Design an enzyme around this catalytic site. Sequence first.
Site, PDB file in Angstrom:
ATOM      1  CG  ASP A 279      -7.435   4.758  -1.220  1.00 31.43           C
ATOM      2  OD1 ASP A 279      -8.313   4.893  -1.079  1.00 31.43           O
ATOM      3  OD2 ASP A 279      -6.613   3.377  -2.001  1.00 31.43           O
TER       4      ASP A 279
ATOM      5  CG  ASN B  73     -12.127   4.167   1.114  1.00 30.68           C
ATOM      6  OD1 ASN B  73     -13.223   4.407   1.004  1.00 30.68           O
ATOM      7  ND2 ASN B  73     -11.419   2.914   1.705  1.00 30.68           N
TER       8      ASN B  73
ATOM      9  CG  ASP C 207     -17.798  -3.189   6.901  1.00 26.39           C
ATOM     10  OD1 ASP C 207     -18.799  -2.113   7.966  1.00 26.39           O
ATOM     11  OD2 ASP C 207     -17.626  -2.149   5.796  1.00 26.39           O
TER      12      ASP C 207
ATOM     13  CD  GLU D 147      -2.868  -0.793   0.417  1.00 26.78           C
ATOM     14  OE1 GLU D 147      -3.090  -0.120  -0.994  1.00 26.78           O
ATOM     15  OE2 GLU D 147      -3.868  -1.817   0.012  1.00 26.78           O
TER      16      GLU D 147
ATOM     17  CB  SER E 222     -12.545   8.558  -2.434  1.00 30.62           C
ATOM     18  OG  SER E 222     -12.350   7.006  -2.928  1.00 30.62           O
TER      19      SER E 222
ATOM     20  CG  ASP F  53     -14.122   6.619  -5.767  1.00 27.90           C
ATOM     21  OD1 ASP F  53     -13.233   6.881  -5.298  1.00 27.90           O
ATOM     22  OD2 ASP F  53     -15.490   6.013  -4.965  1.00 27.90           O
TER      23      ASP F  53
ATOM     24  CG  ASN G 220      -9.124   5.606  -4.447  1.00 24.18           C
ATOM     25  OD1 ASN G 220      -8.246   4.606  -4.645  1.00 24.18           O
ATOM     26  ND2 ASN G 220      -9.750   6.243  -3.429  1.00 24.18           N
TER      27      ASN G 220
END
Length: 129
Positions: free
Chosen positions: A52, A59, A101, A35, A50, A48, A46
């Site tokens: 990270d 994110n 989650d 990462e 957003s 979309d 990202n």
Amino acid sequence: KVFGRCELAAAMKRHGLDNYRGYSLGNWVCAAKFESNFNTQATNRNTDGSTDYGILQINSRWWCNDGRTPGSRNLCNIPCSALLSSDITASVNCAKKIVSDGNGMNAWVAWRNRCKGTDVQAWIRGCRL
């Protein structure tokens, strides 16, 4: 801050990630390597819109607020900039929520693609922990 390999393993253990939800420590070190290369200041946009953040590339679509991801959530209740600190507490505490989650460490696409099914214990080999 750029952590050494065993230095980060030790800090993650101190913060209770070792075997958290059954994921042994090498999983987390492997994920952080791919990462961020162990760099707390890592940021990446990202597709979309957003972003990270930090050593585990958490994110802003779901987990933190950066004030520029319209329609997103902040489920860790933190500014995304807290994820860039030399102190990894915010990243670890938010990672605990993420991995709880429902999908475990599959939430990190890089873990699924580069760590899952591999000898992740190799990432903490030689470390005095």
